[PDB]
Symmetry: C2
Subunit: 191 residues, 2 copies
């Protein structure tokens, strides 16, 4: 997996658009939706099961976590997945992030703030990799790239992000219940 | 999986470009290449392992199997995957296609001509589904969408296309040795 392209994606700035002014699926044959907030618009690709969530028409109170791609699509700035339902109320939750270095092994523990009731895997993946780039030298060297991030739910279900490669596009639009995240366990296979 | 978008895709015309005048990967951060032949140009997305075949710069001796997408990308007509090495010899082979109707039903056999030494899964998938629409009422209506196409190779390796949904984008750029295809087996679970 191209290391230039990997760190380049995770080093990019993100745009958190809460409560979009609009989200429009022009037609079911389109593989995306036009979103806009505060006189700025974007086209957001629907490349996974997220496509089933936005039938033709307008949809209110959606959120978008954007990471702007290199490609312009339908004449607009483009991002893939990262859509979710806006919050119903003010919300913030603090979960444990436990980072383990592995062969071998005590974890380095910190806290991570969850403010969305419904959150895309794009957002969690992006923010958690930033944290690891800032705090654990992830992608700080060509050898600092192997491991996994595991988001564990209160019911013990889990979602895994493999660090040697980018999150797969068809998973960027998957969402989970942020109010039900129990903890985040990280394995780093490099020192 | 949306039936409308499924059928819309396989009903489309294809454009087969043999020996491109150019194929240009502008930069390693891009997710595609610019291709052109004669005076027509397109942008082709590299969304699977195909991305590793085209580093920055030009690449000669390539073919493109295009199916134009709804989205314009980089101000151009767009297609996903479908790239391959052009033939070095005038290779042609007639492969058996065996259609079995799996309703708990001898196979109905015909021939399918391969003219490329290396062929994208996008091209085989697309042509084989046209044949099945033309001859076996695939996507003729609702309930005419279940089954699979299996491309079998000389060493018993195989490649499968599930008919109930579109070929996955990350597989459109995968290529196989057309000279080693042994047969094509189709199981239709409808009538
Ligand atoms: C080459 C390539 O990228 N191929 C992918 C393949 O990786 C991918 O499978 C998924 O791979 C990820 C790691 O990259 C996980 O292993 C997925 O399993 C899990 C997960 O741990 O995340 C299992 C887990 O039990 C699931 N949780 C629930 C509640 O069901 C999650 C969940 O379904 C996903 O995280 C949601 O995005 O998946 C594993 O599926 C496949 C499928 O994406 O696609 C290939 O192209
Ligand atoms: C929901 C979703 O789309 N998930 C996909 C998941 O389906 C996909 O897995 C592939 O699924 C296809 C059928 O759709 C096949 O079953 C793949 O298995 C095979 C195949 O039969 O095609 C197995 C076979 O042994 C392999 N042949 C060789 C020589 O290795 C092939 C081959 O690797 C592929 O055909 C090449 O594209 O695969 C199965 O992998 C996964 C991975 O694409 O992605 C999820 O997102």
């Amino acid at each position: 997996h191209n290391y230039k392209s990997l760190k380049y994606y995770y080093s990019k700035p993100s745009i958190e658009l809460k409560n979009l002014d609009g989200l429009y699926r022009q037609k079911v044959t389109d593989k995306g939706v036009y979103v806009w907030k505060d006189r700025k618009d974007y086209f957001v690709g629907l490349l996974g099961k997220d496509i089933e969530k936005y039938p033709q028409g307008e949809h209110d109170k959606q959120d978008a976590f954007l990471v702007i791609e290199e490609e312009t699509v339908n004449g607009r700035q483009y991002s893939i997945g990262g859509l979710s339902k806006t919050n119903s109320k003010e919300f913030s939750k603090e979960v444990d992030v436990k980072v383990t270095r592995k062969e071998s092994e005590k974890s380095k523990d910190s806290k991570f703030k969850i403010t969305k009731e419904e959150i895309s895997l794009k957002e969690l993946d992006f923010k958690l990799r930033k944290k690891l780039m800032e705090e654990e030298k992830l992608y700080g060297a060509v050898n600092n790239r192997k491991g996994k991030i595991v988001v564990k739910m209160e019911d013990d279900k889990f979602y895994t992000f493999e660090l040697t490669k980018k999150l797969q596009p068809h998973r960027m639009g998957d969402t989970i219940d942020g109010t039900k995240i129990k903890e985040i366990n990280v394995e780093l296979e490099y020192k």
